[PDB]
């Protein structure tokens, strides 16, 4: 029965991502925009657990993966999350999976 992403090995995370990727693909062909975005969030989360939170630092600003020209300013890290805010948007704080920050 389903393991949480935080308990999976790399091999399990990769298999979960492959499965989610195929559903995301069909959702896209069918035009199920909301279902597609749900699968993409899960994929981002699974990817985050294959990255190193240490590569990210408070005060640093990063390009946002899947969104050219947009940047995120990191206030602080927690687990596989970076809390901070998008520059081009409102100063509202937001938690973003580290997989959505373009590596150094």
């Amino acid at each position: 029965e389903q393991k949480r992403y935080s308990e999976m090995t790399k091999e399990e995370l990769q298999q979960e991502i492959a499965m989610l990727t195929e559903k995301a693909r069909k959702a896209e062909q069918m035009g199920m925009v909301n279902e597609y975005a749900v699968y993409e969030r899960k994929i981002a989360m699974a990817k985050a657990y294959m990255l190193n939170p240490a590569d990210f630092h408070p005060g640093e600003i990063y390009e946002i993966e899947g969104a050219p020209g947009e940047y995120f300013k990191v206030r602080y890290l927690k687990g596989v999350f970076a809390w901070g805010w998008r520059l081009k948007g409102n100063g509202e704080e937001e938690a973003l999976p580290i997989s959505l920050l373009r590596k150094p």
Side-chain angles (χ1 to χ4, degrees), residues 11-102:
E11 230 285 66
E12 288 168 337
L13 286 163
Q14 288 281 50
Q15 299 174 307
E16 170 78 352
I17 288 159
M19 172 273 281
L20 294 168
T21 295
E22 175 66 16
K23 289 175 173 183
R25 191 187 67 64
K26 298 176 178 179
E28 178 176 64
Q29 300 186 307
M30 293 176 292
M32 319 227 86
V33 301
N34 290 159
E35 284 81 3
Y36 175 84
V38 159
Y39 292 125
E40 284 306 311
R41 282 176 165 279
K42 290 184 177 194
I43 285 173
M45 284 305 300
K47 284 180 174 165
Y49 280 101
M50 299 196 303
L51 297 180
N52 198 173
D55 301 4
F56 304 87
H57 316 82
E60 251 57 289
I61 310 163
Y62 310 78
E63 286 207 66
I64 300 173
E65 198 81 300
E70 309 197 53
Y71 289 77
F72 190 77
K73 211 297 188 50
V74 179
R75 172 189 158 193
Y76 76 94
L77 293 305
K78 270 282 284 55
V80 301
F81 290 99
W83 297 77
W85 37 69
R86 298 162 182 268
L87 302 182
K88 286 216 297 64
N90 186 306
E92 195 58 44
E93 205 190 15
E94 164 192 4
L96 224 54
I98 57 177
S99 53
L100 298 188
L101 305 177
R102 292 194 185 175

